């Protein structure tokens, strides 16, 4: 599905840009900001956002904080 790949790439780019903008955030705040940014083109799905967050964590774009697992930091 071309639209699924386009949405996944848009969500990953939005997450990376937001994480650079804040340099630290919470899970709910990150999801809210991603939704508010990507609502222009489509309605995001929370499962896809979480999958993109996980795949960016694996790609060493962002990391989970040692103190709290619900906090993300840009690296």
């Amino acid at each position: 599905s071309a639209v699924d790949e386009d949405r996944k790439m848009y969500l990953q780019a939005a997450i990376v840009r937001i994480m650079k903008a804040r340099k630290v955030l919470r899970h709910n705040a990150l999801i809210q900001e991603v939704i508010s940014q990507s609502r222009a083109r489509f309605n995001p799905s929370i499962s896809m956002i979480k999958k993109c967050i996980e795949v960016l964590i694996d790609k060493q774009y962002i990391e989970r904080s040692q103190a709290s697992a619900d906090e993300y930091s840009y690296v």
């Binding site: 809210q32 939704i35 309605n43």
Partner: protein, 46 residues
């Protein structure tokens, strides 16, 4: 809030409570729980 000064949609939770997206966004910046059931808030559906 958009009524007094301006896309407004619904934002459901894991409890399926369906608050306004902007209202729950404003609520979440102060409290981490759902307004109704007072449980930990997790986003679902939009």
């Amino acid at each position: 809030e958009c009524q007094a000064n301006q896309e407004c949609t619904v934002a459901w939770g894991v409890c399926n409570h369906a608050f306004h997206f902007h209202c729950i966004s404003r609520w979440l910046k102060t409290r981490q729980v759902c307004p109704l059931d007072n449980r930990e808030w997790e986003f679902q559906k939009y």
